[PDB]
Design a protein around this nucleic acid. Structure first.
Length: 63
DNA sequence: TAGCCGCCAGC
DNA sequence: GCTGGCGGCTA
């Protein structure tokens, strides 16, 4: 699978970005993560912090 | 190898 | 118009 923010780097790792509209479309590089699901979980909290609530995520813990 | 650039495509 | 993702480049 692929994920929101999550970008395969060609040696086989997963970066995670989010774009921040309050900073007028800035990227915010959440880091790099060994697994796609941990890159995607980094995005999960990063979108939640800029939105505060009501977000479109990789692991919505409400379901 | 990671991150940033910068752009492009997609939504 | 914005966000995500591409993709490559450079650090």
């Amino acid at each position: 699978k692929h994920y929101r923010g999550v970008r395969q780097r060609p040696w086989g790792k997963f970066a995670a970005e989010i774009r921040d509209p309050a900073k007028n479309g800035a990227r915010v590089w959440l880091g790099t993560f060994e697994t796609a699901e941990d890159a995607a979980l980094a995005y999960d909290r990063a979108a939640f912090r800029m939105r505060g609530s009501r977000a479109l995520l990789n692991f919505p813990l409400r379901v």
